[PDB]
Amino acid sequence: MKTVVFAYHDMGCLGIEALLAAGYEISAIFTHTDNPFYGSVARLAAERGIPVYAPDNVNHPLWVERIAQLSPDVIFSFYYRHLIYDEILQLAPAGAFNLHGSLLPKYRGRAPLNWVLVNGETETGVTLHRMVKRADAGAIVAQLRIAIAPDDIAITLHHKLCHAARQLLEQTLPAIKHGNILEIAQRENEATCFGRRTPDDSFLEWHKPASVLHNMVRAVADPWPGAFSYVGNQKFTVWSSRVHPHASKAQPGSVISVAPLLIACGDGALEIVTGQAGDGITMQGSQLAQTLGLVQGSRLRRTRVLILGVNGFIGNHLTERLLREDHYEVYGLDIGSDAISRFLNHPHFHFVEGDISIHSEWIEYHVKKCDVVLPLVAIATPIEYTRNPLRVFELDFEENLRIIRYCVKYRKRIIFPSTSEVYGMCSDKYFDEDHSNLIVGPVNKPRWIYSVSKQLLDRVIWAYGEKEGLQFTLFRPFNWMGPRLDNLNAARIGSSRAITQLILNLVEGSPIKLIDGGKQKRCFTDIRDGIEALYRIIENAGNRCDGEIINIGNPENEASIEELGEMLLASFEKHPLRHHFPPFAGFRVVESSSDVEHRKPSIRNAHRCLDWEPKIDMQETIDETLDFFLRTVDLT
Amino acid sequence: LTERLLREDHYEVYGLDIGSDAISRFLNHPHFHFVEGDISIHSEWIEYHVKKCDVVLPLVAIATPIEYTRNPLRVFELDFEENLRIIRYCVKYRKRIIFPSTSEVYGMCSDKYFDEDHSNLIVGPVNKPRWIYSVSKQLLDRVIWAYGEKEGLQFTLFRPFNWMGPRLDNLNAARIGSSRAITQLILNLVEGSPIKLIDGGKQKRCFTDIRDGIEALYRIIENAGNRCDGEIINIGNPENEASIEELGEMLLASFEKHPLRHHFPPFAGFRVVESSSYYGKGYQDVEHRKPSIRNAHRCLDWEPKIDMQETIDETLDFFLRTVDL
Amino acid sequence: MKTVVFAYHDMGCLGIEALLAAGYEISAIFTHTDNPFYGSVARLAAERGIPVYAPDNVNHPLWVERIAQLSPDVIFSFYYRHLIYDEILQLAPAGAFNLHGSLLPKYRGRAPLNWVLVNGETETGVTLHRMVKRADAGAIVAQLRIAIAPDDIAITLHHKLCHAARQLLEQTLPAIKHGNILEIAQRENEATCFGRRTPDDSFLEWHKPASVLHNMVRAVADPWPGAFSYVGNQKFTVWSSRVHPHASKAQPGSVISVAPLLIACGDGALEIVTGQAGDGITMQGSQLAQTLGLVQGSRLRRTRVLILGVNGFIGNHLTERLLREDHYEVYGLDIGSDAISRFLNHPHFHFVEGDISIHSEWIEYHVKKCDVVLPLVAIATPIEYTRNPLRVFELDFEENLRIIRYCVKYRKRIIFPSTSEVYGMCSDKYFDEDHSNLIVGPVNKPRWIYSVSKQLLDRVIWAYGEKEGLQFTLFRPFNWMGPRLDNLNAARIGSSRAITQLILNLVEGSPIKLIDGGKQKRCFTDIRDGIEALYRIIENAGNRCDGEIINIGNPENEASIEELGEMLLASFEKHPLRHHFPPFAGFRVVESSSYYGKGYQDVEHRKPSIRNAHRCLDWEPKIDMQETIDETLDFFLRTVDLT
C-alpha cells in the first residue's frame, strides 16, 4: 500500500518502523519541530530516505494539494499532536487510522499515560482506531491491554505502551494492507475523556488520601515535571514516594519525622523517598528535610485601582462595585468630584485632583503609586470628531498614549477602553474582537478620525504587550446605560449618548430626531451587567484576561432609535414625575448630514474570560435609566 | 527627484540625510545642498530647515513588512511620531508638505480600482499586527487632513505603487519609494538564492517605471493651477499589473539573455512557501492592488508612458551593471 | 574503605555503582546541578541513601572542612567537570584517583570523546590515574584500549567508553581496596592536551580533506550540536555524512550533485546524508539541498571611527595610524583643527566641529552616524581636580556619561580611556586590571575626585555591558609620550603632563621641580607602542577585547621624576639646538602641599600589568626608554619658535 504518515515521538518512530517492516510504501511523513528522551520521527525519516515535512498547520490548502498529489491509499496517525481535520482525512480511499495510548472509549482525551496513573488505574493499553470528526471516537480496529504495576511511573508505563503498540502494529498492520480487518464501533455512553495537564495540576494537597498523592507523584515522575508542594515560601518537588497505612494522630500536612521524611495525609501518611528543593539537586528524603528546614511538627495588601476620569458614569458605578468588596483601594483622578461626591469620605476611596493634558508628573506619579490603571478620559462625541479633530486626536490619542507608556514603564496593568466604533462598517453579523475586519471610509471622511485613532492605540498597546511585556486588557463597551449618565459635553467614556439625548429630549420637550428614519439598530447594555463584566476584568481570575480584547454588550437588547424612542416614551408617559415636563414634541425624520447599519457584539470572549452573560432584559434597563434621570432633574 | 528638479533651473534642493553616498554626483552642484541630519535625533536643525524652505518632502520611514511585526514600536515611533513632528513644523511655519502616503492604507479593500476619494479602507483585527504600518500611515493622512481643513495647511498626499528603475534603495533602508519585491527578486538572481513565491505568488501587483512616477511627483511639486491643494493622488501604472510569479518569470527571462549573466550563479528556481513561514504568524495579505489614476490625470494631466518590459529590462540592466565583479 | 566521590553523568553513575559493588563505603558524593540523555548522579545517590551535594566551588574552606570531617580513606573522581585542587586532594591517605576518557597521556584535556573523533583516531580508551597538581598528568594505575570503528559516532563511542569504564573499574577497584597497585608514570613528551569545544569548533571548512570533515560530522553528531556550514546567509547542519574518495575538478565548496548532495572538498568529496536547515527538522540530503536552495553548482564598507577631542596627541597619532590602513573612515570631532590640520584635505578624514558640553544632538547624531566611538575629551590636569572639582566632574563624568549612553542607545562600540589614576594607592607591584584593589583617601582629600569619577564611569560602562549589551573596551594609558604633546592646559586625554612640564622647564629656563624630592616612580611609554596597542584594540581581532580592561604602558621603562629630569637634561645638553635656550636653572625640591594645593596624596609607584594587553592584543612594547626620551625632546625643541 501507499501511505502518508502523521507521526511524532516514540510512537511515531515505532509506528513508521512497523509500517516499513510490513511492506508499506511511505510517500511522505508529517511531523513537528522540537520544543526546548523521545526518538525523532524526522531523524528516522531522514535515515530511511523518506521526505518529511513539519508545517504548523498541515490543513493549509497547499499541503492538502501536496498530499493529494502523493495520492495515499491509507493514512496513519501515530501521536501527531496537531489536529488533522476531514478535508485531508478523506483523501485516502482505504481510510485513516490513529494509534492511541489508552483502552478506548475510556481515556480518549489527550495525555492518557499520565491520567491513568493519576486516577490509580490498574490497567491501560493501546488502541488502533479509524479516524473521524470526533476525536478518538472512531471504530476500534485493534486493541491490546497492559497491566499497570503498583511501582510503574510515567516513563516505565510509557515504554510498556510503546512495546504493546509495537506488538499491536506488528500483528494488525498486515491485515490492513489487505482489508482483513473487523471494525468494532465504540460504545459512546461508556466513554471517558481528559484534557491537557498543566504543571499546576501536580500540586500536592495533603488533605487528600495518601494513595491519591502517591499516584500523583507516580504520574508526573522524572523525566516529567514532578509533583510539588511548599514549605512556607520554599517550593519543593517529590520525585519518589511511599504510602504508609500506619496512621498518625497528627493532622494532615504536618511532618511526623524527618528520617524518613513522612507527611501526614487525609488517610495514611506519605513518605518522600527522594525529592529536590527548588531547582537544586535530587537527594534522599532526610537530606531534603534538612535542606528545606523541616523538623518534627512542621507544616506546609489591597489592589490599588487608578481611575482617570472618575467623575461620571463608569467611575461612579465601578467605584461602588470595587468598594463593595474588601480587597480594593480606589484612586479617582479627575478635575472635579461633583458626580462621585458620596465616596469622598469612604476610607478606601481617594480623590486626586488632576488633568491629564496639563499634569504630567502628577499623573505619572499616581500611575507608579497604583497597580491597575483605567484611562476613561477622552472625547467620544461624534460632532467633535469633525468640529475639532485635532483636539480629539490630541486628547484621545497622544495623552492616553503618554498614560499607556507610564504603564509600560512602571510595569502596571492597564485596562483600556477601546471603542465599538473601531469595527466601523464591518459587515459581520457579530462583531468579533479576534476575527472581524475593520472597515472605515476614505481620508476625506474625517468622522473616522476617532475610530482609527482608537484602533491604532489598541495596536500600540498590543505591541507593548508583545514586545515589552505590558499586562493589558482591552474592553469595548456597547451603549452602556443606567443611572448617572455622563453629561453630553463630558470628556469621559461610557454613557450611551443616544439614550441621554432622547431622555433629554423628553425632559426638555424637544422632538426626538430620527436620523434617516432611525431604522439603524444598536445594542444596549444595563450598566449592572456591563460593570459586572468590567469588574470581572479587574479581578482577572486565572489571568484569563491577559492580552484579551473583550466586547461588553448585550446582543439581546438590539433596538432601532425609533423603537427606543417608543419605549422611552411609553415609560415616560406613565411615570409619576411626568407632570413636571412639557408635552411630547413628536418624532421628526431628518437627513443624514444635519453611519453603521447594525452594531452587534460577539460576547464569546466575555463568556470565556469572565464567565459572564448579561442577565437584565431591555425593559427594566429603559425604566431604571429613565426613572433615575427624571428623579435626578432639578425642578422649579 | 533631485535629478529632475536640478534639470529645471528654478529649484533649490536641500537634501537631508545621514549619508551622501547614493547622491554623491549632486554634491558639487551649485543649487544642491546636502544637510547632515536624522529626524529621530535632530529637532531644531530640522525645524530650522523647514522654516528656511518652501515645500517639504518627508521620505524617512520603515516600509519593510517583516519589521512591522518584528519591531512594531520602532515602526510606529519613526513612521508616525517623528513625521508628525515634521508635519507640525510645516503647519507652524505655513509651508507646503508633499507627503508620501502608502498604497497599503486601502488594505484588503475589494474594489477593482483603489480610489483615493471613494474606496473604503479595510484592515484585520488588532491581533493581526502587520496592519500597524497601514493604520499608522492612515491616521497621519487624517491628521494632515484635519490640519488642512482647520488650520489651513497646504498639502498633497501621494501613494506610489511599486516604483522601480535605476538605483533602488537597499532592502534594509528606512527610506521610501523603491519596490521591495523587485529588489528582492533581482537580488535573488544576483546572489543565486531561490525566488520565494509566497502562497504560490499568485497575488497581483501594479508596477511603475521611475520615469513616469517622478514625472508625476515633479508635476505635484509644480502644482500648476494649485490643482493639487488638498488632493490625494495615486501614482501607479494599472496596465502593468502582474503576479509575483509572473514578475519572477519576466525577470528570469531578462536575466538569462543579459550579456553579464555569466558572472552570476545558476538560478536556484522558484520555490513555493507558505505565508506563515516567510512573514511569521498573524500575516494577512492583499489579493490585488490596482490604483485609480483618475486624480493624477485630473490634477497633473499625467499618464504612465512606459511599457512593462522596458521597465523590467532597464531596472535589471542598471542593477547588474552596478554589481562589482 | 571509606570514599568521597566526585561524579557526574554516566561515568559518574557507573563509577558509583562499580564502587558500591566493590564494597566501598561512600560517605558523600559531590556533583553538579544540571544544565538546562545522561544518567543522573544525584538521583542515583538519592536512591542509595547517599548524601549528595552540588556546590559551585568545592574548594571553599568550609567544604574542605566538611570533607575533612567525613575522613575518607581514598577519593575517586568520575567525570566531575569542576576542578579539585590539592588542598582537598591531600586529605585521603590512600590518595585520589580520576577516571579519564582517553588513552593517556594522549588527549589528557577535556572532551576527549569528541576530540578523538575529530582527529580520526583508530582507537581510544579509558584510564584510571592518580590525581596531582597538573591536570590528568598523574601516574596511570589502569588503562584499557577500545577500537574506534569507522562507523562510530560520538554517542556510540560514548557508550563503548562507558562499557570499558565499568570493566576497568570492575577489575581494578578491588586492587585499590587492598593496596595492590602499579603506577606506570606518564611520559610527558608523549602528552597531548585539548580544551573545551565551542560550537565554532564545528564549523566545516571545505578546503580540508573530506575525511577530516567526515570525522568532524562524526564527532559532533546528534545528540551533540552537529557540524555546520552556510548557504548564503542561511546556516545549516550536517548530521550524517559519507566520504567519496573519487576526486572532482570542481573547486572546494561547490555542489557536485544534489541527488545525492555532494560537496567538493580539498581532497575527495563529502556527501551530506542527512542534515537540517537552521532550526528546522532533519531531512535526507536531497530535501535539505532543495530547502536550502542549492543546485549544481553553488558554493558556500569601511569602519567609521568617531574621535571626540581629535585635536591633539592621541587624535593626531591615531588618525595617522588609522588612515595608513585602507578600511577606516575617521571622524575627528573638536572645537579646533590646528593640531590635526594636515589631515583636513585627506578624503577619509572628516573634521566635525563640536563641543560636547554645548552640542547635544550634533554629538548624538555623529555617534549614530559612526561605528566605534573614542571619547578623549576630559580634564586630566591634577591642579584642576582641586581647583575646579565641579567643572572637572561636570565634564569628565556627566558629559561623557551622556556620550556613553548615546553609545548604549545606538548600539555602538565604545573604546573608553579609563585612567591609571583609578588604582590610586594600591600597593601591588603590578597594577592588575582584573585583580588589584583600588585605594583612595578620605573625602577630605579631594584630589581623588578625578580618580573616583573615572572609576565610577568604568563601572557604569561595565553595568551597561552586563545588563544592556554595550560593546566596550576600557584602556588605561601610562604616561604616553612622543611627538606632538598636548598643551598642559588642554582638556584632551593622553600626553604625559610630567614630561611636557619638564621639557617646558628646560625650554623656558625654569627649574625642574621635584615634588617631595621626586622619588615617586612612574612608567613611560613611547607613543609608537601605545598607539600600536590602541590600534590593535580598534581592530579587535577575534573580538578578544570585548568587555576587556587593558593597561597600555611599558613596565621596563621605570623612572623617578628625578631620574627623568636627569635623562632629559642629558639629552638636552648634547642636543644641536641647545644653544638657543637658557642655562639650566637646576632641580628644585618642593613639598606636595604647595604645588598641588591642599589635600594632596601622591602614589609612590605606578607599574602596569600588561598581561591583558599581551593576551588580547598580542602586544609588547618594543621601544627602549632612551629613544623615546630623545625623539620626544628633539621633536619638541625643533617646534619651538626661535628669534
PDB file of N, CA, C and O in Angstrom, chain A residues 342-370:
ATOM      1  N   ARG A 342     -20.329  61.151  46.898  1.00  0.00           N
ATOM      2  CA  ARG A 342     -20.763  60.304  48.005  1.00  0.00           C
ATOM      3  C   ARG A 342     -19.675  59.320  48.453  1.00  0.00           C
ATOM      4  O   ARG A 342     -19.796  58.697  49.509  1.00  0.00           O
ATOM      5  N   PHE A 343     -18.618  59.184  47.656  1.00  0.00           N
ATOM      6  CA  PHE A 343     -17.490  58.320  48.011  1.00  0.00           C
ATOM      7  C   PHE A 343     -16.316  59.064  48.643  1.00  0.00           C
ATOM      8  O   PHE A 343     -15.334  58.435  49.035  1.00  0.00           O
ATOM      9  N   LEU A 344     -16.401  60.389  48.740  1.00  0.00           N
ATOM     10  CA  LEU A 344     -15.257  61.183  49.199  1.00  0.00           C
ATOM     11  C   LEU A 344     -14.826  60.861  50.634  1.00  0.00           C
ATOM     12  O   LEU A 344     -13.646  60.994  50.962  1.00  0.00           O
ATOM     13  N   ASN A 345     -15.761  60.434  51.479  1.00  0.00           N
ATOM     14  CA  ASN A 345     -15.435  60.109  52.868  1.00  0.00           C
ATOM     15  C   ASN A 345     -15.063  58.648  53.075  1.00  0.00           C
ATOM     16  O   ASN A 345     -14.606  58.272  54.152  1.00  0.00           O
ATOM     17  N   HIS A 346     -15.253  57.826  52.052  1.00  0.00           N
ATOM     18  CA  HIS A 346     -15.012  56.396  52.190  1.00  0.00           C
ATOM     19  C   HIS A 346     -13.518  56.154  52.407  1.00  0.00           C
ATOM     20  O   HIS A 346     -12.696  56.699  51.676  1.00  0.00           O
ATOM     21  N   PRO A 347     -13.159  55.346  53.425  1.00  0.00           N
ATOM     22  CA  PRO A 347     -11.743  55.182  53.793  1.00  0.00           C
ATOM     23  C   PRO A 347     -10.870  54.679  52.649  1.00  0.00           C
ATOM     24  O   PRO A 347      -9.705  55.054  52.544  1.00  0.00           O
ATOM     25  N   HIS A 348     -11.438  53.813  51.821  1.00  0.00           N
ATOM     26  CA  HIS A 348     -10.714  53.195  50.716  1.00  0.00           C
ATOM     27  C   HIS A 348     -10.904  53.866  49.346  1.00  0.00           C
ATOM     28  O   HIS A 348     -10.468  53.336  48.325  1.00  0.00           O
ATOM     29  N   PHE A 349     -11.580  55.012  49.326  1.00  0.00           N
ATOM     30  CA  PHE A 349     -11.600  55.871  48.143  1.00  0.00           C
ATOM     31  C   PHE A 349     -10.689  57.072  48.357  1.00  0.00           C
ATOM     32  O   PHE A 349     -10.683  57.664  49.433  1.00  0.00           O
ATOM     33  N   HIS A 350      -9.915  57.420  47.334  1.00  0.00           N
ATOM     34  CA  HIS A 350      -9.046  58.591  47.384  1.00  0.00           C
ATOM     35  C   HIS A 350      -9.228  59.435  46.135  1.00  0.00           C
ATOM     36  O   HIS A 350      -8.873  59.013  45.036  1.00  0.00           O
ATOM     37  N   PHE A 351      -9.769  60.635  46.304  1.00  0.00           N
ATOM     38  CA  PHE A 351      -9.881  61.556  45.187  1.00  0.00           C
ATOM     39  C   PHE A 351      -8.582  62.311  44.987  1.00  0.00           C
ATOM     40  O   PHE A 351      -8.055  62.906  45.925  1.00  0.00           O
ATOM     41  N   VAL A 352      -8.062  62.264  43.766  1.00  0.00           N
ATOM     42  CA  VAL A 352      -6.865  63.015  43.416  1.00  0.00           C
ATOM     43  C   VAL A 352      -7.213  63.982  42.288  1.00  0.00           C
ATOM     44  O   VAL A 352      -7.730  63.585  41.246  1.00  0.00           O
ATOM     45  N   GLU A 353      -6.983  65.266  42.534  1.00  0.00           N
ATOM     46  CA  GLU A 353      -7.257  66.289  41.539  1.00  0.00           C
ATOM     47  C   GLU A 353      -6.189  66.269  40.465  1.00  0.00           C
ATOM     48  O   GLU A 353      -5.000  66.287  40.772  1.00  0.00           O
ATOM     49  N   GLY A 354      -6.605  66.242  39.207  1.00  0.00           N
ATOM     50  CA  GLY A 354      -5.645  66.239  38.123  1.00  0.00           C
ATOM     51  C   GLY A 354      -6.275  66.312  36.752  1.00  0.00           C
ATOM     52  O   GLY A 354      -7.438  65.959  36.554  1.00  0.00           O
ATOM     53  N   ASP A 355      -5.467  66.756  35.798  1.00  0.00           N
ATOM     54  CA  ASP A 355      -5.887  66.994  34.427  1.00  0.00           C
ATOM     55  C   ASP A 355      -4.788  66.431  33.556  1.00  0.00           C
ATOM     56  O   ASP A 355      -3.656  66.910  33.608  1.00  0.00           O
ATOM     57  N   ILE A 356      -5.113  65.433  32.744  1.00  0.00           N
ATOM     58  CA  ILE A 356      -4.068  64.704  32.042  1.00  0.00           C
ATOM     59  C   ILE A 356      -3.444  65.500  30.894  1.00  0.00           C
ATOM     60  O   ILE A 356      -2.375  65.143  30.411  1.00  0.00           O
ATOM     61  N   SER A 357      -4.080  66.585  30.470  1.00  0.00           N
ATOM     62  CA  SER A 357      -3.488  67.424  29.429  1.00  0.00           C
ATOM     63  C   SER A 357      -2.443  68.393  29.984  1.00  0.00           C
ATOM     64  O   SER A 357      -1.490  68.744  29.293  1.00  0.00           O
ATOM     65  N   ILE A 358      -2.640  68.827  31.222  1.00  0.00           N
ATOM     66  CA  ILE A 358      -1.707  69.716  31.917  1.00  0.00           C
ATOM     67  C   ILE A 358      -0.714  68.895  32.753  1.00  0.00           C
ATOM     68  O   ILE A 358       0.463  68.811  32.420  1.00  0.00           O
ATOM     69  N   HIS A 359      -1.179  68.373  33.886  1.00  0.00           N
ATOM     70  CA  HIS A 359      -0.378  67.492  34.744  1.00  0.00           C
ATOM     71  C   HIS A 359       0.296  66.352  33.998  1.00  0.00           C
ATOM     72  O   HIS A 359      -0.374  65.577  33.317  1.00  0.00           O
ATOM     73  N   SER A 360       1.618  66.267  34.106  1.00  0.00           N
ATOM     74  CA  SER A 360       2.347  65.127  33.573  1.00  0.00           C
ATOM     75  C   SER A 360       2.861  64.310  34.755  1.00  0.00           C
ATOM     76  O   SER A 360       2.475  63.155  34.933  1.00  0.00           O
ATOM     77  N   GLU A 361       3.713  64.920  35.576  1.00  0.00           N
ATOM     78  CA  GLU A 361       4.351  64.213  36.684  1.00  0.00           C
ATOM     79  C   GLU A 361       3.380  63.730  37.761  1.00  0.00           C
ATOM     80  O   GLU A 361       3.618  62.702  38.391  1.00  0.00           O
ATOM     81  N   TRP A 362       2.300  64.467  37.980  1.00  0.00           N
ATOM     82  CA  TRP A 362       1.291  64.074  38.955  1.00  0.00           C
ATOM     83  C   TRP A 362       0.629  62.775  38.494  1.00  0.00           C
ATOM     84  O   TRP A 362       0.432  61.827  39.272  1.00  0.00           O
ATOM     85  N   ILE A 363       0.360  62.709  37.195  1.00  0.00           N
ATOM     86  CA  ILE A 363      -0.246  61.531  36.596  1.00  0.00           C
ATOM     87  C   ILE A 363       0.706  60.341  36.649  1.00  0.00           C
ATOM     88  O   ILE A 363       0.340  59.256  37.115  1.00  0.00           O
ATOM     89  N   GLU A 364       1.928  60.559  36.171  1.00  0.00           N
ATOM     90  CA  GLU A 364       2.966  59.534  36.182  1.00  0.00           C
ATOM     91  C   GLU A 364       3.166  58.997  37.588  1.00  0.00           C
ATOM     92  O   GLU A 364       3.262  57.784  37.809  1.00  0.00           O
ATOM     93  N   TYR A 365       3.250  59.921  38.532  1.00  0.00           N
ATOM     94  CA  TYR A 365       3.391  59.577  39.930  1.00  0.00           C
ATOM     95  C   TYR A 365       2.271  58.650  40.381  1.00  0.00           C
ATOM     96  O   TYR A 365       2.524  57.577  40.950  1.00  0.00           O
ATOM     97  N   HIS A 366       1.031  59.049  40.114  1.00  0.00           N
ATOM     98  CA  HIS A 366      -0.093  58.218  40.518  1.00  0.00           C
ATOM     99  C   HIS A 366      -0.165  56.877  39.777  1.00  0.00           C
ATOM    100  O   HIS A 366      -0.632  55.892  40.344  1.00  0.00           O
ATOM    101  N   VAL A 367       0.317  56.814  38.539  1.00  0.00           N
ATOM    102  CA  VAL A 367       0.432  55.515  37.875  1.00  0.00           C
ATOM    103  C   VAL A 367       1.449  54.638  38.602  1.00  0.00           C
ATOM    104  O   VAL A 367       1.183  53.462  38.854  1.00  0.00           O
ATOM    105  N   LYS A 368       2.613  55.194  38.931  1.00  0.00           N
ATOM    106  CA  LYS A 368       3.590  54.435  39.713  1.00  0.00           C
ATOM    107  C   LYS A 368       2.994  53.969  41.039  1.00  0.00           C
ATOM    108  O   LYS A 368       3.177  52.823  41.440  1.00  0.00           O
ATOM    109  N   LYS A 369       2.268  54.856  41.706  1.00  0.00           N
ATOM    110  CA  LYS A 369       1.726  54.556  43.024  1.00  0.00           C
ATOM    111  C   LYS A 369       0.737  53.381  43.014  1.00  0.00           C
ATOM    112  O   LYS A 369       0.655  52.632  43.987  1.00  0.00           O
ATOM    113  N   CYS A 370      -0.014  53.229  41.926  1.00  0.00           N
ATOM    114  CA  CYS A 370      -1.084  52.237  41.855  1.00  0.00           C
ATOM    115  C   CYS A 370      -0.659  50.950  41.147  1.00  0.00           C
ATOM    116  O   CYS A 370       0.504  50.780  40.778  1.00  0.00           O
TER     117      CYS A 370
END
